[PDB]
Write a protein that binds this ligand. Sequence first.
Ligand SMILES: [Zn+2]
Ligand SMILES: [Zn+2]
Ligand SMILES: [Zn+2]
Ligand SMILES: [Zn+2]
Ligand SMILES: [Zn+2]
Ligand SMILES: [Zn+2]
Length: 414
Amino acid sequence: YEVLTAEQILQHMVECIREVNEVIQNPATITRILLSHFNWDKEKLMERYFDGNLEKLFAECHMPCQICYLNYPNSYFTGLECGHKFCMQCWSEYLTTKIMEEGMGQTISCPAHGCDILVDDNTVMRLITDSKVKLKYQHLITNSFVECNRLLKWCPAPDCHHVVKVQYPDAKPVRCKCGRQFCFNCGENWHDPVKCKWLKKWIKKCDDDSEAANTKECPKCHVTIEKDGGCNHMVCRNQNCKAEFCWVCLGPWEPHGSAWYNCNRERSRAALQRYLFYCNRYMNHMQSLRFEHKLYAQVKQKMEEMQQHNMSWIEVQFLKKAVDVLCQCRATLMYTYVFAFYLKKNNQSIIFENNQADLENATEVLSGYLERDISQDSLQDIKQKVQDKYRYCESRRRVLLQHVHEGYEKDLWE
Ligand SMILES: [Zn+2]
Ligand SMILES: [Zn+2]
Ligand SMILES: [Zn+2]
Ligand SMILES: [Zn+2]
Ligand SMILES: [Zn+2]
Ligand SMILES: [Zn+2]
């Protein structure tokens, strides 16, 4: 995997757009519109210009200020070839509002707009003041280049304009330095157990519902509890009760980890019921995963504070790995609920039922540690606890997925 930025793509694109401008001689703005019409197959374009008329080929691809009326120094007016020149600010304003919304083409024509001769790319780049939107345009116009090209896929994050380039599209994990990780092929956050067809079945169904648990009330003292964290081992603070229960199911702790307790598991309405079950773990794990991403921030302080006193950088770096593994196992988990939802009751369903329930408690043992219980322990003691905790956490996942990878080898379920 190679990680590229947004500018690196636009710049790469410009070397591609420009080198093909012999003989086209049409400026970079035009060539890409052409290269989009012929869809970034190169030779397929050059041909269509030669053997027949270009006119048709184009047609397939088709003192004061004049906006805020005022007089400015000539330096403040930038013009187009059309012979209209307005404020640098009126431009940035006509630019930004036009690029944001609504969903537009790849063009941005003249501001007077009856003058429509499209503003060339670079001149749109210089002119947009806010850096956030400059990235949007960069993405906007570039979209065809990476869309029409295999091995180049956008980072599937709302704020990330980076793009991953691969040798071959094998559907494996990739890390964007985002630091988000995702399935290469379908472009969803890395789902190890599930299949893209099955995982995409949910995005339609999860979106199907028109109607995420922020607060809940204690089973023992009945007192209200807000969710902060993190692991689901819940100790409610009221002098009344020391419970000590589980968040997802409001039953106690620790029959969790015991074999006698499964935390894992007219006919028309019977379906929406078992969905509400299975989705609730998917949703609650995502929230419990979110508050773990905070730990990366605290872990930089935990290591910088620990290291100055006693040990060496190589020695402390296990403390990031704990969070890495924890954030790894937390992702692996909520996706096994895409897996478990569709696969039904078969003799292979109850075997993986155990690996998950073993992994579920694996996370809560680690996630509950790095949350609260960690800061009280001694430095010599903690390193051993963190180690043996995420050793099991990591082992479980490989043992969990050991099955799942051979379970799809010869069809066991659906
Ligand atoms: Zn103006
Ligand atoms: Zn004009
Ligand atoms: Zn990213
Ligand atoms: Zn996928
Ligand atoms: Zn209570
Ligand atoms: Zn539970």
